[PDB]
């Protein structure tokens, strides 16, 4: 019953190929609802969720303005970061950020987030107190002191406790039929001989939303974490997700193995076995 709004921004320089690309994608849980890409040919129509349509053109204008300003800010940030690390103008570099808020079933703030990474490495994060910073290195300490001087945390806190929560609640209401619907996994177990001596049991979960799921194998009721191959949860393209977990078992011993599935859309957790 809990929910999260999160923006995932990527700014990437590309010397000799124009200005850095900026893309921001906004999500409510595992549903993308907005994208702004500085390389997009015609904005709009950059994609927006249905339940965003009803917010009207003033809402679109305001967000577009923010994204355009963010594009310039991130480009300038990339220039600053190059200097902070004594880097040459020749290489490509990447600045990423995540910001947003988590709320409970009652819509109350659980916590806020605002953090960055440069070239794949954590750079600076707003702490859970929404008042202080954690800087990863002496470069990020420069950013920290600039943000302290300008009382930036206070501005981020105001967004995270105010705007973020208020709009997440709105989106949830307006999109309740989808955003507040958990679709349970459709599950089955398949059997794949490897040799005369052993076979793979694969436990499948399909068609579930949101993406969070627990899928495990037990042998005689004992967790087989070390012996389980667990693929990354993957999008199907219809909003739902898929996952499987596999174990290699000795021929004839299949009934000793049970697959266990937990997910928000299930009335209760599943226990599944191979059914030949």
């Amino acid at each position: 019953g809990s929910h999260s709004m999160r923006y995932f921004d990527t700014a990437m320089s590309r010397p000799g190929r124009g200005e850095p690309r900026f893309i921001s994608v906004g999500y409510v849980d595992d549903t993308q609802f907005v994208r702004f890409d500085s390389d997009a040919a015609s904005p709009r129509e950059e994609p927006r969720a249905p339940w965003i349509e009803q917010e009207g053109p003033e809402y679109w204008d305001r967000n577009t303005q923010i994204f355009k300003t963010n594009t310039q800010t991130d480009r300038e940030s990339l220039r600053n970061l190059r200097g902070y690390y004594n880097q040459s103008e020749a290489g490509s570099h990447t600045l990423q950020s995540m910001y947003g808020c988590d709320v409970g079933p009652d819509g109350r703030l659980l916590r806020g987030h605002n953090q960055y990474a440069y070239d794949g490495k954590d750079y600076i994060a707003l702490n859970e107190d929404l008042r202080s910073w954690t800087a990863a290195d002496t470069a990020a300490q420069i950013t920290q002191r600039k943000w302290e001087a300008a009382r930036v945390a206070e501005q981020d806190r105001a967004y995270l406790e105010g705007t973020c929560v208020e709009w997440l609640r709105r989106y949830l209401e307006n999109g309740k039929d989808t955003l507040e619907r958990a679709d349970p996994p459709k599950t089955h177990v398949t059997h794949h001989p490897i040799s005369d001596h052993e076979a793979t049991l694969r436990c499948w979960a399909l068609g579930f939303y949101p993406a969070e799921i627990t899928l495990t194998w037990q042998r005689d009721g004992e967790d087989q974490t070390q012996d389980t191959e667990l693929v990354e949860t993957r999008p199907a393209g219809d909003r739902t997700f898929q996952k499987w977990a596999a174990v290699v078992v000795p021929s004839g011993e299949e009934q000793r193995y049970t697959c266990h599935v937990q997910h928000e859309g299930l009335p209760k957790p599943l226990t599944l076995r191979w059914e030949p």
Partner: peptide, 8 residues
């Protein structure tokens, strides 16, 4: 709703 980002 997006957030204004600050210069690093």
């Amino acid at each position: 709703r997006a957030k204004f980002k600050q210069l690093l």
